[PDB]
Amino acid sequence: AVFYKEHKLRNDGLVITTNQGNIRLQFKSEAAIEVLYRADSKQLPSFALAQPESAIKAQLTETENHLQFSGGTLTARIQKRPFAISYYRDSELLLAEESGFQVNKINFRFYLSPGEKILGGGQRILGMDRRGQRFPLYNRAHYGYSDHSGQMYFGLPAIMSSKQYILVFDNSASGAMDIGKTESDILQLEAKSGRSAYILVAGNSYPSLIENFTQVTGRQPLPPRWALGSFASRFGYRSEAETRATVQKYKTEDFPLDTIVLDLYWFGKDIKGHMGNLDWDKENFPTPLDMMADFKQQGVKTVLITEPFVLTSSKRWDDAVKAKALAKDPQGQPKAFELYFGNGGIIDVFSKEGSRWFSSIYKDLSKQGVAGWWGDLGEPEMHPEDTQHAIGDADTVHNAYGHRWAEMLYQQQLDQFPELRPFIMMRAGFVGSQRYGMIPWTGDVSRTWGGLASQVELALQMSLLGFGYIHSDLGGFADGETLDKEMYIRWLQYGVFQPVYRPHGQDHIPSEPVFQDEETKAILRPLVKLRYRMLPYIYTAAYQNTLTGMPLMRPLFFSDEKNPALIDNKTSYFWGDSLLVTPITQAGVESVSIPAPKGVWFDFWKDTRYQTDGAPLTLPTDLHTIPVLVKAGAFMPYVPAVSTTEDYRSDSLEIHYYADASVPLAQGEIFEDDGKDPNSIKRNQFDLLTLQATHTDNQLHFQLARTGKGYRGMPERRATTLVIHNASDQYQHLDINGKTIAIAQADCASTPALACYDQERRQLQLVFTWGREALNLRLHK
Amino acid sequence: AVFYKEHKLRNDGLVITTNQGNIRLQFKSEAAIEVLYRADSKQLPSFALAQPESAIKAQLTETENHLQFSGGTLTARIQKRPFAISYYRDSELLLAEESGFQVNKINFRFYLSPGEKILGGGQRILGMDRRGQRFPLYNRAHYGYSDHSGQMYFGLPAIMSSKQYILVFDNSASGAMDIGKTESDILQLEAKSGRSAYILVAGNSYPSLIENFTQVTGRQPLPPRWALGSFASRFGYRSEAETRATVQKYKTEDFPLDTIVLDLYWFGKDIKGHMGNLDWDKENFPTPLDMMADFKQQGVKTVLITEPFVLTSSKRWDDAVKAKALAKDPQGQPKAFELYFGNGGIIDVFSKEGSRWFSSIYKDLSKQGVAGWWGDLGEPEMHPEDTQHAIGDADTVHNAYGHRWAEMLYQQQLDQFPELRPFIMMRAGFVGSQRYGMIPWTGDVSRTWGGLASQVELALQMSLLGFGYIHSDLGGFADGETLDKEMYIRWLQYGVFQPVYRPHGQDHIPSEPVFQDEETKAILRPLVKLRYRMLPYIYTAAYQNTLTGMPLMRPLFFSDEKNPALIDNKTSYFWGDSLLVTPITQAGVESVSIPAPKGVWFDFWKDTRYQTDGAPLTLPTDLHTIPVLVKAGAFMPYVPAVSTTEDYRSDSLEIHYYADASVPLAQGEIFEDDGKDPNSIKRNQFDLLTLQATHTDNQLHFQLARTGKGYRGMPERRATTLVIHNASDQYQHLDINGKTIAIAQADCASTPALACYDQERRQLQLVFTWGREALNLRLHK
Ligand SMILES: *[C@@H]1O[C@](F)(CO)[C@@H](O)[C@H](O)[C@H]1O
Ligand SMILES: *[C@@H]1O[C@](F)(CO)[C@@H](O)[C@H](O)[C@H]1O
Ligand SMILES: NC(=[NH2+])NCCC[C@H](N)C(=O)O
């Protein structure tokens, strides 16, 4: 039995006393509130909040039976007897405590509304709506998973509801979530220890909800543009010669390549026994500085793997112990335990000593030429209960280990190279880890169609809760004895339309596309080149993700927020604003039914126009593509393919506009900067191109403009080819800034025409110079 | 009747007095002699000699009836009565005067040996052996020529004999050559005026003959590497917008492009009336500095056309007259005459005033950003007899006008940009013009199969007499009403294997490959890319041409100097040392008979091995290639394709070696420098890679090395893939500098293998790092 006794309102937090203790409420924004139970006691700090100490001014009002603590849009309604808090946006109930907080173990119980659908929990393969499921909150490997998992590498103690709120359990400890499984109408959060707090974030739409969520948990800094390029990876290159041979293979096979990734053989010849060496195995990598410099000359970055563990057999054991860098046992000695790789300890990233020691090693390797970092096994993969960290035992801090590891490395990289954007790829984190630039991948997926078929669900679940660059080991990682060629092709095709292009797998079967047969390469080469040609599209989506948290992959349900049934879809998704992608995830599929939203759509590959009032579209499949539809009104921007983003230029732009009278107004943008300055957005050192189309019965008008302060090397004038798909055959003239130009009606492909209409393709091509001043192009019948 | 009277031997020239006057003999080298009749009188200087005043020490010996003036290898035997000079190499008679020199008009008569075959005269379409022909020495347009011409743009007063000598008529005047036509056994040279001299050069082989010839007439300076890239050209881009649209089309169609060429519309909107303006038509080219700068940003050079003529209607007429820059009439007034383009005069490049005036204009335009120069109509196309130049009348200097024009422009460009290599493309020159960097093309060829079929004969005739970069308007230039697609494709395929890749034609039919249909582009795109991938092969041949005069295209007859019948062949030729090319020059050809020299040959496209003891090889044709055979023992070097040579890198090399036991020793080289320094060779600022193969019964050994001082940006270590074609399946191991490496026998395409044998292709691939130290690779059975 819990009831209200008293409250204090200073400041600007609400402190409530019940018969059971203190509760602190603080608005972290107009749309987000942090609720801390046991506010009286000492406990772990928030990990989820980007600014834990902030508290914006709210209004408090009191009545006989209730308190009301209200921010801009979000209101907390506090019922005095029995004590229960409920949350409202406008006058709409979002979420209500049932029993709410209960003590010893930590326990939060909320009511769920009938029909309420619940996404969340991070990586699970359970269905998009996780209501009716119970699962642990304990980051844990799931080697070789395929089509089901209740527990994987990167769980999140957070949910997103069809009521358009996000609830975060701001707790790092071994726990569990019960989403109306045990009791149909109860959401239960549990933890063995740790912080007893939750955060509720509201929004008026899913995009606004995600914007509000990332406002308080952190926005991802724009990654280096090279993160969007082609990665060479396997587990693992065995030598410098093999690594050099692989870079060379990309050159001789004419596949783009930005980055090569070195797995654990860079520090030892065996899988076991060397982890912790954190230094080059000179028997097999004899000249690593020259190797990295030679790669940089070819525009290729080098990324190295690192892990939390230092083995007793490794060259750094004695030094780590001496430095007090490792987690301890209750006795105060370094804790050693049996990992797959051997007996070893874990670097205590929560301590000053561990952080300084580990950071110094990253600094040294980075000075040698390492461009980015891969942090594997950060669950931590093995984490005995009696392990003691500076701020708590293993079970208490477990789900924040990887998160703090990312923070440490992010801070380190920014201190060493304040003019570069850190690249940090990790397997396990916490709510908010995106603010440290964490780029997660979905772990050791099996080489099965089931493994591929689960990737959209996983990506969308992580994308919705803050992680825009979630991606998979393309082609599959685990086991297998011979390449499943059709599966591999489908996986690398899908790869083009998801955040990071990194084929990776155990090296008994090649993961890199350059080591495939002629048919496979003939299919994938123009697709990897397409990835590069589409960099302006992808990099602009990245820009929007940094600005607003908008994920690069968006679920189908964004298309109609009043149709909750769409939430179940995990087979079609949006890549940026304009492309509806439906990966092929079974062998031999001859056609697909695409649940395209009501409107006009074009076949990305064939230009075919489809119109639908709601009924799904049936498209035939082929081996060389996967089904992709373009939304009418889309501006799709391209640059010429380059081999590496170091050579990226937009002196030449080609933009495809998908015209249809059903879209009388359309807008596009292209974000351009130097691809590397971490401060480009803050300082406005960018070139933001905007395009607006106005489509009426007798005219199609485009207004082009540029804003921003520009940047070093920005082209003053871009040669631009605008291709208008589904263009009327009735346009008689073009005005460019008032100057009339005839539209040629033949030989469009065979003359340097400035305006020409191709009657067979229904395409109207305009070629012009896009300089710094506004440009108006008007087509008139 | 002529007879010897007296001689003086100082110094070191021989001066002979006959009853008719003085004759001066001077060795210009051990292998070349200049013979000047009327040595007593004042006459035009030599144009053919690079060092006219030189005279090396020779030996003179006298007998009752003869004088002997002897250099290293060449000896002049002077018969006293009747007077006649004959020339010997060793004790072999090369050439004997008949009546020799006869006066008023200039006339030289020599005996021809029975069976002696005679190439020469420069551009004619008459058959490789011109014996039995008579033709004028008067540079003259032959618009729309096809399969026959006795008189074209670029005649040369020179012949090459199967006796392995070259005879030059060192005379610039309107004349004629009668090669045993009128009198079966007489070679007659005639001129209306000008210098009465000839030069005889001997050699012990055709390569040595050409080396000796270019030693005394001039060696071509290495062109900028960009000269070997893709040119966009037509007659003509009508505006800046059209020019920008064409550069953009190369970008959007993914064809390489180094240079765009602007025809006469850059200075006026009409073909007639504007010539002489030598300045931008701002109505149609409003921002030419920005245009050229924008192209440079994309790695694209701009070349402008210029002509010798200044029209009275042009903006520069009054100024040219004021400056005394134009040729005059006998009265002393500027000479004006009716050209196709209108009434106008000719710039007197032979005068100080004309040279200074014209040079100042090139300087100004070059400062604005023009990268190279196209000089059209230098015959001069129209040249009235009464026209007076500073050094003689039109008929006297005619065939040296273009030559002096090139010298003027070359000197100008070197003075303005001493750190760049001039690019000078012209239609008409003289013996020796190559020393001013002249790059000639074969004029206004018709768009017919006949026009294409004549190009090998023309190229070989010019190549043998000093002009390595002779080439054609690819696809054809003149007339036509609709594209002959098959002809166009064949012409641009041949284009890949001849010196300069410049499609060009009258613009009612597109000349650029980017304006062609999908099938045409699908065929040509990978071929234009091949051109770029083969830059190390082509640029190395260019290097050899600068060193020794060795032409890039070599005739079949080089393959067997004891088989004079080969001289007639004008259908197959060598592109560099290793490729035997047979262009397809008729429609619908289904197969070809290739007269491959005795030995082992491989199909360049299919890898098929052929062996022949002399009988021709029959190969089937296809539309996507033309027949090319690779000589056994060839090292064919490639780099990855780039869009422009400004991006050229050899960090990655791929080298194909064509192994056969019939070739126990083979050598290759790759010349690398910065692609732009005119002094790179002289100063040894280059990286010369050498490869040697030793092929025995049980071993194949490669020795790799580098010499030269290197250059700025040179890669220290190149990733190298060596592909050995027709490799034995019996090699069991590889030693690289003594370190043994196993040869994998499977999965060569699908692993980062360092050594692997592909049993299905009979190819053995080695991948390694080629650094600055010598490298030995040994394969052993
Ligand atoms: C962690 O472990 C590895 F298997 C070996 O380092 C990686 O290759 C794998 O991608 C990652 O999950
Ligand atoms: C000279 O005249 C032109 F026809 C016009 O300038 C050129 O296009 C042609 O290539 C050249 O022979
Ligand atoms: N994280 C997981 N859900 N792991 C499931 C592992 C199941 C497997 N049979 C094992 O015990 O090893």
Ligand SMILES: NC(=[NH2+])NCCC[C@H](N)C(=O)O
């Ligand atoms: N240089 C030449 N061979 N020209 C031949 C031109 C022939 C042509 N019938 C004419 O008189 O115009």
